Design a protein around this ligand. Structure first.
Ligand SMILES: [Zn+2]
Ligand SMILES: [Zn+2]
Ligand SMILES: [Zn+2]
Ligand SMILES: [Zn+2]
Ligand SMILES: [Zn+2]
Ligand SMILES: [Zn+2]
Ligand SMILES: [Zn+2]
Ligand SMILES: [Zn+2]
Lengths: 336, 336, 336, 336
């Protein structure tokens, strides 16, 4: 089996031959057709997060492929299905959060391409109970971002409380933000999209945004206040200190700021104003299995189309180099 | 009419005589039996808050008195009723937040003892539509802190989402905390009380706390996780950097931290861990008129008893710098 | 002033000159341009409801016009605005439901066209605090049904708990249903529209329905179950016993049936299945002033277009027996 | 193994020796210490429900006992634990409802003592994933009714939306009602208890009820409206036509009526008034595994104590005929 392997942190990945996974009870083997790439894989490759991955590691948490083998007793998933192996690789099923449909918080969870070998290979293994069933409408390459950017942003907009007709602000129309934009519109929301580029403001407007702001030409918060009077919710994707503060202060009283990005250090919040304005700051990333089904259904109905460009497994270090220089407009999917 | 007046910021209040208020339509004149004092009155006297009160100012937002005069058209309040003038002196009645029962967020709101003359006098004026109706069961000295600490902490626990049988952490057993703890117990909650003193821990235990922690002898986040497994909600009264730090870390995954104190500068939060653990940070101060009714009823049912000491209007500057040195165990109420 | 008056029940309305309304404080006089007609006006003319209107009565609760005169101290509405005088003519502003933004449930409420003279006239009076401000985009004759059918069905879909992406069933594509359709579509919902005619099936599919069913040709409950597996929510507009039964049994487990129609008598429900399936049966009619602004905004943005026929005020009784035999495809509005 | 077996519906149960259960993977063998009895067992023995149990059947869904054998791969349940085998014997774990923590609605669920042999025996089998963990504080006999009556009524009060300080009404203080009012009091609610006996009125008053009503001496609807102005929520345990209407009309506008009883036929509801008052009728029985843990914790803390009388397995037909005559004051638990 060919696989791109992280041998040790910061040092380039080695495309090399390794054994195929063998199944234990409840697992299926997936012949990978595609696997999306995002910044989580980078942080997995660099090991710069608080809890580090197990080396050597096959990254990838957006693998889409065909089930070619099922272990004894797997009935729900059948050989031939097209499934996804997401970030939420497995959960305990018995804890506080598993019992209440909050599988994303399970303290015993395994994470695909981080705590366990992911889809940067020709075959990947996963538990039948946690794979995502890909709808028949969708190509594996175009769907792979939904397993990550899709479910994360869709769940964040549910968490935000924004109801149809209300205004939402999305700070950062990058990898996730350009996908967060289409979910918001499909959820009956009016969107103000905020970025730092005339190109992305054009991108956002073409993807459906009602208002696009080049944040380096207009102060976005007083433009949001002057035009729509503040937003009921704001999705903070860009988590640099300025965009986070700007996303916060765009939220009117009694509104919610949902943060979906993972910043490098702590972030300051004017708690003083937070108390007198009844504002909430909620954290949210990825989603529950039920969240996954709904996120994928929006794509199956055509309401959310990721901007994708394919790359070969061998180019994985060049995609990473390309990702650190910020020249990825959208997301890049590995093809197999 | 005798009144304690702020003529200039940070200089001592002058007890002196001044005009009785005369009513325009919709307002009532109450002769004040008692008026509580909290730190908000001092921040009005020092004017160290972003938006300052215009001088001269009669402070006091916890005034309880007897209606002795009603303007023309006052259908509700009658002469002889015992009413309270709270922090939410008035609201527009037609904005976004007034139509949805969120009067605390009205951008045109006037605040008792800050933007309008309050209860540091023998007579105060207030609109009939926004005065609190004090229940017949209670003594004006006993119920004045409910108008502030009572409704604030009760509404905070409501928005905390903590349900009967769940565990709540209250950081700061001070003016608000000792009242917050009684409300939590009355809502079926198990309480962990956290403070900086063996005496305050022995105060919270007496008031009903299931667990009381001296924060300078045990690591409180160590004890809460070891004994309870993290709390579902935490009320942050003490908003110093380390207490805010500990209160946050005591909330388990998916839980909410409600902040009720007003800090002097921004506060840092590990937004990284906030995202991965689905944690919410909500701000909450004071409560709506409906909130005020429900808070007063708990006190009318004997479930909340504020620890109160009396003082008279002339020693108002002595209670202020007694408050700044921090040995007011509970709250003080002005006697008239 | 010309007005269509109900002198007594079940006999024809008389067009007749009457006195122009006198404005007391807080009220406003409106020169009516158009006033909608629905079945509530008929029940008001026939007096066949539990609590009857006191006679003589000028019906009409969907009146749209120009304010020509404001009383003393009218704070918000200035002469020249276009407003609407809905079914909730006024509320006390003090009770349990007024304080929490549930003004529709105020036990002291007055109802336009029923408890007070409505818009079946050239001029109508209404309190400034409770008239709907029509947006500038909309012409008075097409927006009149939003005051009734628009705010009712929109609030009903909010009460239903149906979230974007989910399926809803709308039983009855009549007056309220054809408007319910568009609101649901604008809220991200997929819609199954059920009625008794091939003509209304195309009517629903014409305005956005994903599925239309002629209830007299297919079993709609088996159709809904075979095609979408039951609906999270169902809106019951047709409250004849067979449509109510079908609407209920189209709701899946854990779902909600919102009823907006007003039936003649009690209706039977399989509470046995309600208990074991976790189903809710909620009632909802009209909407609060906030609900009215939101429902009006959807029409302002062209997302809800009522199907409308004009008639002169003198044809009112022709419109009524027209209505009693089901000739009306949509709604009819009086023109002035 | 000794067991009470239903060989044929309506004909007495036979206490007879049968084969003890054999373990397949994931299951545990429990030696029953106690097993409560309720009317669900009666309807299982009479086979008078829509979907009947297949015979022969060992009833019992409140069996408490000690685990004496676990199949291989069972690691969470350990030999020696005291577990419960509730009505929710097993769920599929993948459907719409199992994914969202609503496993009570799983269409593939198996029911203890109905779809599979239950606790009317010395040994009963159950899946480890779905047994209830009995707290160490409590004796198997007094904890058995928590498995049924306890979790049902606790969930129904959670579904009722009733919040601390608000008033609840419990109609029928029999088997479920006398556990319901304890839960309500433990959740900070004020309880009006309604029955048809002065002996049960006093029983409720002894168990914590704030007001007890004998419905056959006072009109309970006028008593509730005149003493408290209607209740925000009402639990309907007695589902006879008269008490169902009384429970409904006890609910004030915007309130919720939760029904936990299983009536024999459809019940009429004045849908006309349901719409105009915005009242909800919700159905709720048994609870989720998480609900079971919270229900059991209230008993562990001593806030819910069922009224229990012991009988022996051989007297199973004599408690049944005791049950049909209505001589059961509370609940009766079989002892082994
Ligand atoms: Zn990703
Ligand atoms: Zn878990
Ligand atoms: Zn306002
Ligand atoms: Zn205060
Ligand atoms: Zn109408
Ligand atoms: Zn009212
Ligand atoms: Zn039972
Ligand atoms: Zn299931």
């Amino acid at each position: 089996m060919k696989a791109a392997v992280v041998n040790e942190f910061k040092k380039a990945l080695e495309i090399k031959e390794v054994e195929r996974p063998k199944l234990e009870e409840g697992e299926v083997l997936v012949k990978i057709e595609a696997c999306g790439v995002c910044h989580t894989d980078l942080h997995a490759a660099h090991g710069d997060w608080p809890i580090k991955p197990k080396l050597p590691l096959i990254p990838g948490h957006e693998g889409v492929g065909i089930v070619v083998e099922v272990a004894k007793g797997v009935k729900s998933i059948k050989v031939g299905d097209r499934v996804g192996i997401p970030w939420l690789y497995s959960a305990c099923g018995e804890c506080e959060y598993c019992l209440t449909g909050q599988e994303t918080l399970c303290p015993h969870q395994l994470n695909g391409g981080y705590s366990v070998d992911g889809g940067y290979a020709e075959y990947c293994k996963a538990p039948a109970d946690y794979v995502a069933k890909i709808p028949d409408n969708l190509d594996p390459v175009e769907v792979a971002p939904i397993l990550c950017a899709g479910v994360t942003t869709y769940k964040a907009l549910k968490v935000s409380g924004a109801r149809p007709g209300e205004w939402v602000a999305i700070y950062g129309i990058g990898g996730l933000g350009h996908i967060a934009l289409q979910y918001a519109k499909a959820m009956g929301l009016n969107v103000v999209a905020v970025d730092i580029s005339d190109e992305k403001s054009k991108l956002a407007k073409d993807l459906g945004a009602d208002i696009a702001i080049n944040g380096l030409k207009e102060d976005p918060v007083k433009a949001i206040h002057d035009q729509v009077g503040g937003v009921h919710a704001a999705i903070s994707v860009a988590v640099n200190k300025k965009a986070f503060e700007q996303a916060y202060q765009s939220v009117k009283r009694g509104g919610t700021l949902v943060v979906v990005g993972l910043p490098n250090a702590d972030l300051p919040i004017p708690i003083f104003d937070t108390v007198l304005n009844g504002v909430s700051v909620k954290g949210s990333i990825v989603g529950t299995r039920k969240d996954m089904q709904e996120a994928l259904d929006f794509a199956a109905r055509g309401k959310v189309r990721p901007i994708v460009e394919t790359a070969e497994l061998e180019e994985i270090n060049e995609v990473f180099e390309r990702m650190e220089k910020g020249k990825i407009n959208g997301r890049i999917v590995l093809k197999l």
